[PDB]
Structures are given as C-alpha cells and as structure tokens.
Design an enzyme around this catalytic site. Structure first.
Site, short mmCIF file in Angstrom:
data_model
loop_
_atom_site.label_atom_id
_atom_site.label_comp_id
_atom_site.label_asym_id
_atom_site.label_seq_id
_atom_site.Cartn_x
_atom_site.Cartn_y
_atom_site.Cartn_z
N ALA A 301 -11.27 15.33 -13.09
CA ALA A 301 -11.16 16.73 -12.69
C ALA A 301 -12.42 17.53 -12.99
CB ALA A 301 -9.96 17.38 -13.39
N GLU A 305 -17.12 14.39 -7.73
CA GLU A 305 -17.45 13.07 -7.21
C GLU A 305 -18.01 13.14 -5.79
OE1 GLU A 305 -14.41 13.83 -8.36
OE2 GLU A 305 -14.23 12.76 -10.27
N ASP A 347 -56.26 23.06 4.76
CA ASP A 347 -57.57 22.86 5.36
C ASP A 347 -57.67 23.67 6.66
OD1 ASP A 347 -58.33 21.03 3.34
OD2 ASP A 347 -57.31 19.41 4.41
N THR A 349 -60.26 22.99 9.63
CA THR A 349 -60.65 22.38 10.90
C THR A 349 -59.49 21.65 11.55
OG1 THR A 349 -61.48 20.44 9.73
CG2 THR A 349 -63.04 22.21 10.20
N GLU A 438 -71.37 18.17 18.18
CA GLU A 438 -72.35 17.58 19.09
C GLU A 438 -71.81 17.48 20.51
OE1 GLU A 438 -73.84 13.87 17.54
OE2 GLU A 438 -75.27 14.95 16.27
N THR A 615 -62.37 25.17 3.42
CA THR A 615 -63.26 24.87 4.53
C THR A 615 -64.48 24.09 4.05
OG1 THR A 615 -64.62 26.88 4.37
CG2 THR A 615 -62.58 27.02 5.59
N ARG A 668 -66.63 24.92 0.95
CA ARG A 668 -67.49 23.83 0.50
C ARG A 668 -67.15 23.40 -0.93
NH1 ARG A 668 -73.50 25.68 2.90
NH2 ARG A 668 -72.84 25.69 5.09
N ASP A 693 -56.02 14.46 4.11
CA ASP A 693 -55.89 13.36 5.06
C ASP A 693 -56.69 12.12 4.69
OD1 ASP A 693 -58.36 14.48 5.46
OD2 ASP A 693 -58.25 14.51 7.66
N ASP A 697 -58.26 12.83 -0.97
CA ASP A 697 -57.22 13.84 -1.17
C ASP A 697 -55.95 13.27 -1.79
OD1 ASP A 697 -58.87 15.81 0.00
OD2 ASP A 697 -58.19 15.22 2.01
N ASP A 790 -11.90 18.29 -0.04
CA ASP A 790 -12.90 19.33 -0.26
C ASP A 790 -14.28 18.96 0.26
OD1 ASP A 790 -10.82 20.59 -1.49
OD2 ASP A 790 -11.70 20.61 -3.51
C1 LIG Z 1 -17.10 21.45 -14.17
C2 LIG Z 1 -15.87 21.93 -14.88
C3 LIG Z 1 -15.69 22.60 -16.05
C4 LIG Z 1 -14.32 22.97 -16.54
C5 LIG Z 1 -16.80 23.05 -16.95
O1 LIG Z 1 -16.77 23.01 -18.15
O2 LIG Z 1 -17.83 23.54 -16.25
C6 LIG Z 1 -18.81 24.27 -17.01
C7 LIG Z 1 -20.25 23.86 -16.81
C8 LIG Z 1 -20.70 22.47 -17.14
C9 LIG Z 1 -20.97 24.88 -16.34
C10 LIG Z 1 -20.14 26.14 -16.11
C11 LIG Z 1 -18.75 25.75 -16.64
O3 LIG Z 1 -18.18 26.49 -17.75
C12 LIG Z 1 -17.01 27.09 -17.52
O4 LIG Z 1 -16.53 27.23 -16.42
C13 LIG Z 1 -16.35 27.54 -18.79
C14 LIG Z 1 -14.95 28.06 -18.51
C15 LIG Z 1 -14.05 28.12 -19.73
C16 LIG Z 1 -12.66 28.63 -19.42
C17 LIG Z 1 -11.71 28.61 -20.59
C18 LIG Z 1 -10.32 29.11 -20.22
C19 LIG Z 1 -9.33 29.02 -21.35
C20 LIG Z 1 -20.05 26.61 -14.64
C21 LIG Z 1 -19.61 25.48 -13.73
O5 LIG Z 1 -18.99 27.64 -14.77
C22 LIG Z 1 -18.48 28.32 -13.71
C23 LIG Z 1 -17.51 29.36 -14.19
O6 LIG Z 1 -18.76 28.12 -12.56
C24 LIG Z 1 -21.31 27.31 -14.09
C25 LIG Z 1 -22.69 26.68 -14.23
O7 LIG Z 1 -22.62 25.51 -13.37
C26 LIG Z 1 -23.38 25.52 -12.27
O8 LIG Z 1 -24.09 26.43 -11.95
C27 LIG Z 1 -23.23 24.24 -11.49
C28 LIG Z 1 -24.51 23.41 -11.47
C29 LIG Z 1 -24.48 22.31 -10.42
C30 LIG Z 1 -25.77 21.50 -10.32
C31 LIG Z 1 -25.82 20.52 -9.15
C32 LIG Z 1 -25.02 19.25 -9.32
C33 LIG Z 1 -24.94 18.31 -8.30
C34 LIG Z 1 -24.23 17.13 -8.45
C35 LIG Z 1 -23.59 16.86 -9.65
N1 LIG Z 1 -22.85 15.68 -9.97
N2 LIG Z 1 -22.76 14.82 -9.06
C36 LIG Z 1 -22.26 13.57 -9.55
C37 LIG Z 1 -22.06 12.45 -8.75
C38 LIG Z 1 -21.59 11.28 -9.30
C39 LIG Z 1 -21.31 11.20 -10.64
C40 LIG Z 1 -21.50 12.30 -11.45
C41 LIG Z 1 -21.97 13.49 -10.91
C42 LIG Z 1 -23.65 17.79 -10.68
C43 LIG Z 1 -24.36 18.97 -10.51
C44 LIG Z 1 -23.12 26.18 -15.62
O9 LIG Z 1 -23.01 27.22 -16.59
C45 LIG Z 1 -22.46 24.85 -16.05
O10 LIG Z 1 -23.21 24.46 -17.24
C46 LIG Z 1 -24.46 24.96 -17.12
O11 LIG Z 1 -25.30 24.80 -17.97
C47 LIG Z 1 -24.60 25.71 -15.80
C48 LIG Z 1 -25.70 26.77 -15.88
O12 LIG Z 1 -24.91 24.77 -14.79
#
Ligand SMILES: C/C=C(/C)C(=O)O[C@H]1C(C)=C2[C@H]([C@@H]1OC(=O)CCCCCCC)[C@@](C)(OC(C)=O)C[C@H](OC(=O)CCCCCc1ccc(/N=N/c3ccccc3)cc1)[C@@]1(O)[C@H]2OC(=O)[C@@]1(C)O
Ligand code: NA
Length: 981
Positions: A301, A305, A347, A349, A438, A615, A668, A693, A697, A790
C-alpha cells in the site's frame, strides 16, 4: 615526449636514442614497453548481469517489496491454490523491472568505447631487427618507434613527423573538430610549447587519417598520453549526477522507510494491551500471522508499483514526439533535465547560422591624391552558391569588367582558392566543394564575369565553374602557401602563359599591415596614412555594423621573390614571402542566421533561459552578430559580458567564475574553455546545455548537464551527448526545452495522483491494524489498483493540455518538491478520507448492511475470538469474518475514489467548475476502461476467487457512491481555499 612539437627532429631522436634509418632495437622495444605500456586505451569495466541485478535490488523500496514477497511466500506455505498468487505477482513485478533495467544498460552506448573505433588494428614501423618495413599490431607500438604512414592509413599514435617522403602531406583531422578540410603538415618545430593542436603543424594525432602523401615519423606518446587519450581520461573522470526526479526517488524511499517503521511501532503501542492478555490461548499463532500479512499489505500500500511504468511510458512517448521536431533525445531520464535548462551555450556557424557563405559587399580603391581618397564599394545579390547573381553599385546593375580594380580582384578570388563549385541533378542545387568561405569567392567571380564571357548558352554544370576556368587559363598556379593562424593569410604563386605574381588573401589587419602600395585601377600608388585609415574604417563598418560581415583583404606582390630563393617547406617563412604587398581590395561575406533563431532567442528571454554564443570570429563581429540575432541590444553596453580566449585566460580564477555568470558571448575560445565555462556555470547551480560536434567537444558534452550533438557531427560527439539535433538547428533546442517543461507538467500531476493513492491505502491499513478489524484490502487487490486501475488514468494524465504560458515562466528549480506546503496538507486530508472511506465501507457490510450479518463493533474488533463461540459472540459462523463481499465494498470505494481523485488531478488549484473534467478526453476514456476492468475481476469467474471478491448488488453500489463521491467535494473545498486565500 610531452612537447615533441616544440622539439626539432634531431632532439626527438636524441631523447629516445633511436636512429631514423635503423629504428628501435629489440632491447629498446622491451624497455620502452615496460615503461610506457601498450598503445591502447583502457578497456571498459563492464558490469556483470549479476552486478545489474544486484543494482536492481539495491533500491530500498525494491528491498521492501522483496521482503514482503518472502513473508508472503512463507504465509502461503502455511495457510487454497490462490494463496501463492500474492507472492508470485510481487516477484513478477521485481523480475520485470530487473529485466527492463538489464535491457536498458545493454542498449546504452559508452562514448569511451566509441573512442576505440579510431584505434587502428595495425601499424607500420621500422625497427633494427629487419631492414624493410614491418606491419605490426598498433597495440604493440611504443614511444620512440619509427613509423611510416601513407594514404588511407589511420594514425596509430601521436607521431612527430621526421621526413615527408612525398611532395606534400595532408591529414584529415576531422575526428577532433568535426567535418573539416584536410590540413597540410610540415617538419619544422613549432616554437610555442603551450600551443594548441591546430597549430602543431609537425604532429600526427592518433585516430586521424592521412588524406594524401606519405611521411616518416617518430612516436611521441601512446595510450592515454595521446591527444585522444587525454580526452578519454577527462570523460572517465566526469561523473553523471542523478536527474532531480531520480534523487527524489532516493529521498521518497528513505523517508517512506521511516514512516513504515514508525507505523509498526505505532500499531504495537496502540495494541499494547495484549501484554495484559492471558497467556493460555491459540490466538498467538494467529496473531503473528495477522501482523505479518498486514506488514505485507503495508508495504504494497505504501509503494507505487505502477509509477515507474507510467513514468517510463510518458518519457518514451515524448521522445517519439520530439523526434518529429528533429530532437533526438537518447536518455529518457534526461528529458526532465531538458525542461530545467537555465543556460544554453551554442555554437554559431553550424547551429545559429546556415553556414552558407555569400559575398555581399566589396570595395576597391578608386582614387588616391594626397589626403583625398575615394573607394568603389559594390553590392552582390544572391545568397546561395549558385552563379545566379548581379553586381551593383548604388543599387545599379554594372558590368564588372569596366573597373580594372575588379579584374584583379576576381583573379585573386579565382586563383587564391582551393575550393570549387559543382551542380547536382538529383537536387537541382549547386553544391559546395571545399571551404564555405572559399566557395563564396568562386561564386562571386561567376557573378562578376569580369572578362564579359558568354555564359547564357552554357549548361548549368558548365556555368558553375566557367568564369573561374577562364581566369585559370590566364595564369599558372606554381605553388600555394597554405593558411596559418600566425599570419592569418594564404597566398599562391602564379606565372602567365610580364613577370610572376603572388595573390594573397587573409584577415584585414595582417594583410594590410604588409601592404606598402595601393592598387588604383591598373596603376600603383604607395600606401599612405589617409588611405590605410579609410580602408580600415570600412572594415569596422562591415564587421561591427548591422551587416556583420566577415572581411577578407585581397592583395598582390607585384615583385615576388625569386623562385630559387624561396623554401616551400618552412611554414615560418611564409609571412616573409607575403610582404611588400599592394592592396587590391576587400571582400566581405555573410554567414546569415537562420530564420527561426531570432524568435527562439526571444522565447529563451521569456522563459528565463540565458543564451551564450561561441564563435571563431573576432570580438567585434561576435558582439555584432549577438546584437543581430537578439543576444544583446543594439545600444546595450557589453563591456563585461563578452570575452575572448586570451581575455578569459588573462583573468584570475576568481574573475573567470564571475565572468561566466554575466557573459553571453565567447569568441575564439581555447579547446579547454568549453569545459571551464560549464564548471563555472555549475558552480552557480546552473543547468547547462552545451553544443559540440567533435572529440574535442566530447569532455565538455559529458560534463554539461545536457550535451547537444549535431546530426552531421562525429559519432563520439553523439554518444557523449544527451540530445542530437537532426537538422543542426538552434531552434530545435528551444523546442526540445519547451516540450521538456510540458512533459514534466503532466508528469508532476500523475505522480501526485498515484502517490496520494498510496497515502490513502496506508491510512486504510493502519486503521485496520490499530483497531483490530479484518483485512479490508488484500495486497493482491492493492497491486491490481496501483498497476492497472490507477495506472491507466495516470497515463491519461500525461496527456493533459499544456499551459499557454509555459515559455513565459522562469526555469523550474531542481530542488522543488512535488508535494509540499498546502498541497502536503491536502493529500493528508484526501488520504485520510480514502483510508476512512474504505475501512468504513467493509465495516458497513459487516455491521449495518441488511445483506450482511449485523455484528457488534467489539465482536469485529475481537473477531479472532470467534473460534471460542463465546457467549459474547452470537454463534455467528466465524467464516463470516473472512467473507469476500466486505472487501469489495472497500475496493469499489477505493477504485471510485481514485477515479474521482484522477479528475481532481487535472489541475492543482483550479476548480472543476472552471476547468471541466472533459478537457482531457483520454482521462475520461481511461476511467471507463478501468471501471470495466473492475467489473471483469468482479464477474468473470476465475478472477474473483483470485482477488477474493464477489459481485455487488445495485443497492450496494449506491452506498459506494455516497461514500466516494464527496471526495470531489472535499478536494474542491481545498482548492477553493488555495485560490481565494
Ligand atoms: C507513500 C505513503 C505514505 C503513507 C507515506 O508515508 O508517504 C510519505 C512520504 C514518503 C512523503 C510524504 C508522505 O508523508 C505523509 O503523507 C505523512 C502523513 C501522515 C498521516 C498520519 C495520519 C494519522 C508525501 C507523499 O506526503 C503527501 C501528503 O503527499 C509527500 C512527499 O512525497 C512526494 O512529493 C512524492 C515524491 C515522488 C518521487 C518520484 C517517485 C517515482 C517512483 C517511485 N517508486 N517507484 C517504484 C517502483 C518500483 C519499486 C519501488 C518504487 C517513487 C518516487 C514527501 O514529503 C514524501 O517524503 C519526502 O521526503 C517527500 C518530500 O518526497
Ligand atoms: Na552530460
């Protein structure tokens, strides 16, 4: 020998102690091989397939998935055939990503390996063991060897030329600089030790080809010590920084590891009451299994993925889209850095101009009488190499033969010229044969027709080289003093069919300084003050003014030295032979900028992208060309914003870095300056795009954030670059940068969409473990949503219409997070809703659902105690707590929410009432398919047992809608806050 070019042929032999006739003895080859090694570049340290696979499993998120898969396999081992589906699916994802990674590396090309295509297999040497020549492996050549090269041979090492066994020696040094004309070589030493390779007239560089001739030489350096070897060591040292998004994945991975671990501590602290639980009881083997299969669900979750599949498919489609705009992007991750370009170094030319020269103006001396003086300025029509033009004076057609100064002017352009014209029938356009500057002269004398020859009835092929040939019949080209950058001129020695003559052409300052007389028609007048000042003034009007012309001073030596008193092999004495000249006239030609460059410069201004011109023109013309295409204003001061090679090197390292922050024009430049400018820009955290090129470079292309090669450039320049311009046009760069910002705008959106779904899924699973409820969502279901349900609207979000002001905003900062500030609080409220909507959906069917058995919340929380048939329980079948129906409520709620959340992802802050959801047609179509896929797994008989699901009644779907639809209302409220507050 590091500086064998500055040493005489005797000093090079005395250094190694080798004879030119005998060669290196077998004992010398033994010791020279141990000292200098073998004449070859180091081989690539290729990674094993095992090494790549490890690299695939080095990512923390991948490691988490692998751990979850292992836990799942054990749980399936101790649990129904569907049990082992969950481990297999997770593993398949990992296996596929690894296969994708392996395929990507195999397809990847290495420039350093490319450099090996310029390493010849064989080489010819003279050694003391044999009297004749030996053709040995070029790898076994050592410094100090006597090497013979001829036509067709590829130069095996950096060789100091000893004796040229032919008349002349021409070398094709095109791998270093790109498509260029052959260079004449000599044997006399070059005085400057710090001289550049273009001025090493006595050196053969490894990898170059012998255009014509045959010479004997001594090997100076081998291996990495050669000029092509030094370039390899610069490329090896260059480290490729990760793209900003790649770094963000590294960040998102390590921060997600902290949240997952803190959730495991949170669930343990919330369920700490189990320490006061009695000891006798069989629910402990069920408890450890319960928290283990939640840990597997918690990992699925949290990790998106499907996000890499959606990312790599949006970049792959953008690459196909850029290819139609002549932008060939090689690396997919580099498309993000393309939209972030802050400075573009281009560049002139090849890219900024069309590289099709044409003479536009020319003047000859009309009259000299003491302090009075007058010139005969002319204008030439026709911008192509075709001989279809017209000579004008004051915009009036004239016959060039009526002016005697133009007759001598045309004979210089026809004789002091190594180029020619040619007509091609497959294209119907006259083509260029040789240098562009030329070829403009040969086209010029065809438009002149100074001898009034009849060319109307001549064929197009005959018309190309007709007036030239007539002049060629009049005089005999005895020998040619080739161009050299020390005197910046060339001359030819001619005799009639009257004494001999010499026709000189070159840069105005050098040629005019060597003129003591002035041609006035057919007479001759000594060069005086007011005449030289009038000539040099018009030179600056054409080179600095709005014309931006390249001027060439044409002169003759009416009394050349005697033939026997000239040495045609001493290139240093060529300037002495070109003295006591008589000024004939000046010819000015234009390298016109491309049509789309002027508008592309303005697009960079509106987009906050700085353009830097590079240039080979003088500082005066380079600044003039910048003012023409729009780099500088016409009356903008540019005292500290334009530098040359000498000016830049005469600055200390402190003022050099400060200069690169404000300079927009470099004229130059030395070969090392491209890499120095990149480092100075990178020191200010600029994202630099550099053009090139040639192998010269190549190190600057790798060091820059985005190397830009030419479609007609060398293979090494292409393999070293991140993008290749198919049409060599500068406008392709701006169009590629514009598309790069548009891709990331949509790429920023579907990343936020898939990531926010993973946030809500974790809140759903955290509520399940914190309260003690049955699993509302199973890792198999979460994988199907994060990959398919999704992933389809996420791909559809990559086709969102781009903003109409993309090129009106400054470039994006690489350190800009995707989710922060108020958006960080939005996806917490959104994720907090999805987590509560799904858990409450499964708890509804279990508790308040008519179709389902009503159950107390205590019973649901303590459902694992049903086995006891407790009086607290009502004797309800314990199998109910494993019923499929409740998991479909949580799944259909999650699916419908993400369909609604995908509509809210069309814009970050704009309302759906303002920006409607039907703006993206592909998004609505992807939602239909995703929902139909939800019914496929719900109804097609094999699937629901695999996903542990059962169909929903028409009344049950209405409950899903009244729980899922308020997501749009919640997100619209949050958007309404950001807009008006
Ligand atoms: C993902 C799910 C959860 C629950 C979580 O913990 O996510 C936290 C989290 C890690 C961040 C935070 C999140 O924190 C929260 O939501 C805290 C809420 C607490 C609520 C408590 C309620 C009782 C984020 C989600 O909170 C919200 C609210 O959105 C926001 C932010 O995240 C991003 O900006 C996304 C960058 C993507 C970068 C691109 C990317 C592409 C592919 C990826 N994998 N491909 C895979 C393929 C195969 C295998 C594996 C991977 C991974 C990343 C962040 O702070 C982020 O930790 C950071 O440093 C920031 C700046 O990155
Ligand atoms: Na690079």
């Amino acid at each position: 020998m590091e500086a064998a070019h500055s040493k005489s042929t005797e000093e090079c032999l005395a250094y190694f102690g080798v004879s030119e006739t005998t060669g290196l003895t077998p004992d010398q080859v033994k010791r020279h091989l141990e000292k200098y090694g073998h004449n070859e570049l180091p081989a690539e340290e290729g990674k094993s397939l095992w090494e790549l696979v490890i690299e695939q499993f080095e990512d923390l998120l991948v490691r988490i998935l692998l751990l979850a898969a292992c836990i799942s396999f054990v749980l399936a081992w101790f649990e129904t055939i569907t049990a082992f589906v969950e481990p297999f699916v997770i593993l398949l994802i990992l296996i596929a990503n690894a296969i994708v990674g392996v395929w990507q590396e195999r397809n990847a090309e290495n420039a350093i390996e490319a450099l090996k295509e310029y390493e010849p297999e064989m080489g010819k040497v003279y050694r003391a063991d044999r009297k004749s020549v030996q053709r040995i492996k070029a790898r076994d050549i050592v410094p100090g060897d006597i090497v013979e090269v001829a036509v067709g041979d590829k130069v095996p090492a950096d060789i100091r030329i000893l004796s040229i066994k032919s008349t002349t020696l021409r070398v094709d040094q095109s791998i270093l600089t790109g498509e260029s004309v052959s260079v004449i070589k000599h044997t006399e030493p070059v005085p400057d030790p710090r001289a550049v390779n273009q001025d090493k007239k006595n050196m053969l560089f490894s990898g170059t080809n012998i255009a014509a001739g045959k010479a004997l030489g001594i090997v100076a350096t081998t291996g990495v010590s050669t000029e092509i070897g030094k370039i390899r060591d610069q490329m090896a040292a260059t480290e490729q920084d990760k793209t900003p998004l790649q770094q963000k994945l590294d960040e998102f991975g390590e921060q997600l590891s902290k949240v997952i671990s803190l959730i495991c501590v949170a669930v343990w602290l919330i369920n700490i009451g189990h320490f006061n639980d009695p000891v006798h009881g069989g629910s402990w083997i069920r408890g450890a299994i319960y928290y283990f299969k939640i840990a597997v669900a918690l990992a699925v979750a949290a990790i998106p993925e499907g996000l890499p599949a959606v990312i790599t498919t949006c970049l792959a489609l953008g690459t196909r889209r850029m290819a139609k705009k002549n932008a060939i992007v090689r690396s997919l991750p580099s498309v993000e850095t393309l939209g972030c370009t802050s400075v573009i170094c281009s560049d002139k030319t090849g890219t900024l101009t069309t590289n099709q020269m044409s003479v536009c103006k020319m003047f000859i001396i009309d009259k000299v009488d003491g302090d009075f003086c007058s010139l005969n300025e002319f204008s030439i029509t026709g911008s192509t190499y075709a001989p279809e033009g017209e000579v004008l004076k004051n915009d009036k057609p004239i016959r060039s033969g009526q002016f005697d100064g133009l007759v001598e002017l045309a004979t210089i352009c026809a004789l002091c010229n190594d180029s020619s014209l040619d007509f091609n029938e497959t294209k119907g356009v006259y083509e260029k044969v040789g240098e562009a500057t030329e070829t403009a002269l040969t086209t010029l004398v065809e438009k002149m027709n100074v001898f009034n020859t009849e060319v109307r009835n001549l064929s197009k092929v005959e018309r190309a080289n007709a007036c030239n040939s007539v002049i060629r019949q009049l005089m005999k080209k005895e020998f040619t003093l080739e161009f050299s950058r020390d005197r910046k001129s060339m001359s030819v020695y001619c005799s009639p069919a009257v004494g001999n003559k010499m026709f000189v052409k070159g840069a105005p300052e050098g040629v005019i300084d060597r003129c003591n007389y002035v041609r006035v028609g057919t007479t001759r007048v000594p060069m005086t003050g007011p005449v030289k000042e009038k000539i040099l003034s018009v030179i600056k009007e054409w080179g600095t003014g709005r014309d931006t012309l390249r001027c060439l001073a044409l002169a003759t030596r009416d009394t050349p030295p005697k033939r026997e008193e000239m040495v045609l092999d001493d290139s240093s004495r060529f300037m002495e032979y070109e003295t006591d000249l008589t000024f004939v006239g000046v010819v000015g030609m234009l390298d016109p900028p491309r049509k789309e460059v002027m508008g592309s410069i303005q697009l960079c201004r509106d987009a906050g992208i700085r353009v830097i011109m590079i240039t080979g023109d003088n500082k005066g013309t380079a600044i003039a060309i910048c003012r023409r295409i729009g780099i500088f204003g016409e009356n903008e001061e540019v005292a500290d914003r334009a530098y040359t090679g000498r000016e830049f090197d005469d600055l200390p390292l402190a003022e050099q870095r400060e200069a690169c922050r404000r300079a927009c024009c470099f004229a130059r430049v030395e070969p090392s300056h491209k890499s120095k400018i990149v480092e100075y820009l990178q020191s200010y955290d600029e994202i630099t795009a550099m053009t090139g090129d040639g192998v010269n470079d190549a190190p600057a292309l790798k060091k820059a954030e985005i190397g830009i090669a030419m479609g007609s450039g060398t293979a090494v320049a292409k393999t070293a670059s991140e993008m290749v311009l198919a049409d060599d046009n500068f406008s392709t760069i701006v169009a590629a940068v514009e598309e790069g910002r548009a891709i990331y705008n949509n790429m920023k959106q579907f990343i936020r969409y898939l990531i926010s779904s993973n946030v809500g899924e974790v809140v759903c699973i955290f509520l399940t473990a914190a309260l003690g409820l049955p699993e509302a969502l199973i890792p198999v279901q979460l994988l199907w949503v994060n990959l398919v349900t999704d992933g389809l609207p996420a791909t559809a979000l990559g086709f969102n219409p781009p903003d109409l002001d993309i090129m009106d905003r400054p470039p994006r900062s690489p350190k800009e997070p995707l989710i922060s500030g108020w958006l960080f609080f939005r996806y917490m409220a959104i994720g907090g809703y999805v987590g509560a909507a799904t858990v409450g959906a499964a708890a509804w069917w279990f508790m308040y659902a008519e179709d389902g058995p009503g159950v107390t919340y205590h019973q649901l929380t303590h459902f694992m105690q049903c086995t006891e048939d407790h009086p607290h329980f009502e004797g309800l079948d314990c199998e109910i707590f494993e019923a499929p129906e409740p998991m479909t409520m949580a799944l259909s709620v999650l699916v419908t929410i993400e369909m609604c959340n995908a509509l809210n992802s069309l814009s970050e802050n704009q309302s759906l009432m303002r920006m409607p959801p039907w703006v993206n047609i592909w998004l609505l179509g992807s939602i239909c398919l995703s929902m139909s896929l939800h019914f496929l797994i719900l109804y097609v008989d094999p699937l629901p047992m695999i996903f542990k699901l059962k169909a929903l009644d028409l009344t049950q779907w209405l409950m899903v809608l009244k729980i899922s639809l308020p997501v749009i209302g919640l997100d619209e409220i949050l958007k309404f806050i950001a807009r008006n507050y």
